[PDB]
């Protein structure tokens, strides 16, 4: 291949870091540890894949260049560019089956694998399309991602539901014990559609957003999703399954409402957690007229007790929770006051910002 390009280190570092995102620490196939490099029509394209998803970055070429393509070890190429001094010019060319990287008096010869062997996701057609600000997509993902399952047997939970309804985009994540749901207006009428993005893809899409002025263009196909922002293109296969209904988890008619300062609740649960069981992380909540008592016990019979002034008018009740799930919600709510909607000791509890209904959190209790 004729491939030749010269680019500033500063214009190459962000693309290299981004496209390397889907790359695992232990590739099963050597090509899976490589980035595909392509020069065509004055543009350098860089691609990284894990076979489920791919991340593409485009770099404008202003210095003399020659079209072509090759694949190069991602980690080594990134480390070389990162290790070069600030303001370095990186001159790249092919010489047989090796890729030469030159900058000042630094010379690097890298092994390559043919661009023709680089794995490509199959062609697909978009069926749903919309544009939204990066900050809106980031908020939807950040507000719910911690509630996704990691390695649940119910494979359809190891990811996030993206649902379009009316003019809103909604994200749902659950692991079967706790759920997170966030809805945002996107100012565009949309058909009713719902898809499951794998958790690895969700994390990839989140990391590519920086909340800047660049809109995010989303394309949803029957088995794939694509997100384009600036010079970056993220594509992933979708999880082929049926996501449960978040609405059946919502407390139907909660008769008990608790309101308290978010940081005050967070610090009390964090201290009580120290003496909670290491495996089960159970804490007991006793709610009475304008008071919350949090207690935690462990097998060593150690005990933590926290008493808080809260706003509470309802019948006295005792309810158990996994303190980590509660802390995850309080950490996700970047607010001053929190509202908790309860029914009884065996039913789900809804937690949200007392001032905003944008995001809602549902935690199932533990039997005391």
């Amino acid at each position: 291949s004729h491939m030749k390009f010269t680019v500033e280190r500063e214009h190459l570092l962000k693309p290299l870091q981004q496209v390397s995102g889907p790359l695992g620490g232990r590739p099963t196939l050597p090509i899976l540890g490589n980035l595909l490099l392509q020069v065509a029509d004055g543009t350098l394209s860089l691609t990284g894949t894990d076979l489920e998803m791919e991340m593409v970055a485009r770099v404008a070429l202003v210095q003399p260049h020659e079209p072509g393509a090759t694949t190069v070890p991602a980690r080594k190429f990134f480390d070389i560019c990162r290790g070069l001094p600030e303001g370095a010019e990186i001159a790249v060319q092919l010489e047989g089956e090796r890729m030469l990287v030159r900058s000042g008096r630094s010379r690097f010869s890298l092994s390559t694998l043919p661009a023709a062997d680089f794995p490509n996701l199959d062609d697909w057609q978009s069926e749903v399309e919309f544009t939204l600000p990066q900050a809106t997509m980031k908020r939807l993902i950040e507000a719910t991602q911690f509630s996704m399952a990691h390695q649940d047997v119910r494979y359809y939970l190891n990811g996030m539901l993206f649902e379009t309804e009316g003019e809103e985009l909604r994200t749902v994540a659950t692991d079967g014990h706790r759920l997170a749901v966030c809805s945002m207006p996107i100012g565009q009428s949309l058909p009713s559609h719902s898809v499951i993005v794998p958790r690895k893809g969700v994390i990839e899409l989140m990391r590519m957003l920086d909340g800047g002025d660049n809109p995010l263009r989303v394309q949803i196909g029957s088995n794939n999703i694509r997100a384009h922002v600036g010079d970056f293109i993220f594509t992933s296969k979708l999880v082929d399954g049926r996501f449960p209904d978040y609405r059946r988890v919502l407390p139907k008619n909660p008769d008990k409402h608790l309101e308290a300062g978010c940081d005050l609740l967070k610090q009390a649960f964090a201290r009580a957690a120290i003496l909670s069981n290491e495996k089960f992380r159970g804490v007991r909540l006793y709610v009475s007229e304008n008071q919350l008592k949090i207690t935690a016990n462990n097998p060593e019979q150690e005990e933590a007790e926290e008493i808080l002034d809260v706003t509470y008018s309802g019948a006295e009740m005792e309810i158990g929770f996994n303190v980590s799930y509660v802390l995850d919600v309080l950490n996700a709510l970047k607010c001053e006051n929190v509202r908790m909607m309860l029914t009884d000791s065996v039913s789900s509890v809804q937690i949200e910002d007392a001032a905003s209904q944008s995001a809602a959190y549902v935690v199932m209790p533990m039997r005391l």
Partner: peptide, 6 residues
């Protein structure tokens, strides 16, 4: 821990 009624 109780399961969410999914």
């Amino acid at each position: 821990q109780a399961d969410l009624x999914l």
